[PDB]
UniProtKB/TrEMBL annotation, chains A, B:
Range of residues in the leader sequence: none
Full protein name: CysB
GO molecular function: DNA-binding transcription factor activity; transcription cis-regulatory region binding
Similarity remark: Belongs to the LysR transcriptional regulatory family.
Residues of the full protein shown: 93 to 324 of 324
Keyword Nucleus among record annotations: no
Keyword DNA-binding in annotation: yes
Biological process according to GO: cysteine biosynthetic process
Lineage summary: Bacteria, Pseudomonadati, Pseudomonadota, Gammaproteobacteria, Pseudomonadales
Keywords: DNA-binding, Transcription, Transcription regulation
Domain of life: Bacteria
Coiled coil: none
Length: 232, 232
C-alpha cells in the first residue's frame, strides 16, 4: 500500500527520522511519500485527502475536517554563542531576553504565538531582527553573531550543538503541543496505525478506535484532556 | 539607517552568511532586519516596499515593479550515501536517475522546474518520494537511506558533508540564476549598494545607476545579457 505524510521542517528534521527508519524497516513494501510545506499547506492537504497525515504544532487546529490528535508536548530554548552575555546570568528572565536582538520563528510557525504572549503580558517588546522559517537558518545566524536564538527544544541538542550554549527557557513560555491529523472518514490501515503508534506511543489502536468517532473538536478534547503526553 | 532583506532557505543558509557578517562589521549602526519565506511572499514584500531587497532564484521575474538583477549562476548535484550504485557510474545519466527514488525540492522552489524540464524532454518520469522545501531536510533523508538527493550545488560542501557523495549533474540540467530585486523608485543608499556589491561584485554603482533607469524587463535584459556571472 501507500503511506503519505505532509509535515514541517521541525518534525521532518528532528522528530521523524528514527520513526521513518523504523517504519521503512518494518514495511519495506509500503510506498512511502513525504512532503514538506507550511503548516497551512500540509494541514489542508491532509484535510482534503491529498495525503494521509499532517504532523505539526500549528494550523492543524483550524481544519474541522481533521481528526487531530496530540503527539507530544515541548517548550523552548534560548541559544547563544559561547561567552554571550546571557550565558553569564545565574538565571534567564524575560527582561534580560527582551534587551537582546532576537532570531526566532516567523509569525504562525512553531509556537511563535507563545513567545509573543509571554512578552506582551509583561509589557515587553522583543527586538526581532530575523524572522526565520526553520531552526537551521536560526542557528546559522545565531552562530555568526546576529543575536539571540529562540527555538523549540527538539531543534537543539547539547552534544550535537556544542558550538552553541543552550539555556532552558521553558519557565518563561507556555508549552506547545505537536499534533497529527487525518481526514475524518479515513480508513486506518494496519501500517498507518503502526506509524502513528511509533510516532506517539499513547495513540494505541484502542484509542484510535475512539478517536475516529469524534464528530468535532469538542469530542476530541473530551477524549484526550485526561491523557498525559511525552515531553521533548 | 535600515537594511531589510527577505530571502529563502537557500540564500539565507548558503549564500548570505559571509556577506552579512562582512556587512555587520562594516556598518555596525545600520539596523539590519531579515526575513525568510517562500519565494512568492518575499518577492511581493520587495515589490510593495515592505523590505528593501528580495533574493531568490524563483518568483522575482513575476513582479514588474521590481528592478531585478542577476547575482550568480548555479546548477544541481546528486548526493547519495557512500557505496550507492550511482557512484559506480563513470558519468551520470538522466535514465540512471529516473530509476531511483528521488528526494528534491517541491514544485516552484530552487530550480525544480529545470529538473522537470530535463526529465520530460527525455520522456522520463522521476519517482520523487520526498518533495522538500529545503536542502537540510533533503540531506537528512538522503543520509537516512530514503533515496537520491538532487540539490543546488551550494547546498552541499565536500568538507562539511563528508558523509555524502556528490556527483556532478550539471551536464543534465540547464543552469539557474539567483536574483536580487528591489522596488522601482527605491533610493539606493550607500550601505545598500555596498551590500549588493558584496553579494554580487559585478553590480557596481555604475551598473546600479544604469539598472534603476530600466522601466521594464526588456530594458533590464538589454542591460544584463552581456555580463558573465560567477558560478557556484
Amino acid at each position: 500500500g501507500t503511506l503519505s505524510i505532509a509535515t514541517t521542517h521541525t518534525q521532518a528534521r528532528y522528530a521523524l527520522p528514527n520513526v521513518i527508519s523504523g517504519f521503512i524497516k518494518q514495511y519495506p513494501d509500503v510506498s512511502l511519500h513525504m512532503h514538506q510545506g507550511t503548516p497551512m499547506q500540509i494541514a489542508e492537504m491532509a484535510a482534503d485527502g491529498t495525503v494521509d497525515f499532517a504532523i505539526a504544532t500549528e494550523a492543524l487546529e483550524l481544519f474541522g475536517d481533521l481528526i487531530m490528535m496530540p503527539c507530544y508536548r515541548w517548550n523552548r530554548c534560548v541559544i547563544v554563542p559561547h561567552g554571550h552575555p546571557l550565558t553569564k546570568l545565574p538565571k534567564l528572565t524575560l527582561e534580560a531576553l527582551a534587551e537582546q536582538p532576537i532570531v526566532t520563528y516567523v509569525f504562525g510557525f512553531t509556537g511563535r504565538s507563545k513567545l509573543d504572549e509571554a512578552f506582551s503580558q509583561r509589557g515587553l517588546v522583543p527586538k526581532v531582527v530575523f524572522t526565520a522559517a526553520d531552526a537551521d537558518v536560526i542557528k546559522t545566524y545565531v552562530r555568526l553573531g546576529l543575536g539571540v536564538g529562540i527555538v523549540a527544544h527538539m531543534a537543539v541538542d547539547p552534544k550535537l550543538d556544542n558550538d552553541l550554549v543552550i539555556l532552558d527557557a521553558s519557565h518563561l513560555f507556555e508549552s506547545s503541543v505537536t499534533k497529527i491529523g487525518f481526514r475524518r472518514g479515513t480508513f486506518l490501515r494496519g501500517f498507518m496505525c503502526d506509524f502513528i503508534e511509533k510516532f506517539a506511543p499513547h495513540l494505541t489502536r484502542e484509542l484510535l478506535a475512539k478517536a475516529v468517532q469524534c464528530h468535532n473538536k469538542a469530542e476530541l478534547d473530551e477524549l484526550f484532556d485526561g491523557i498525559e503526553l511525552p515531553v521533548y
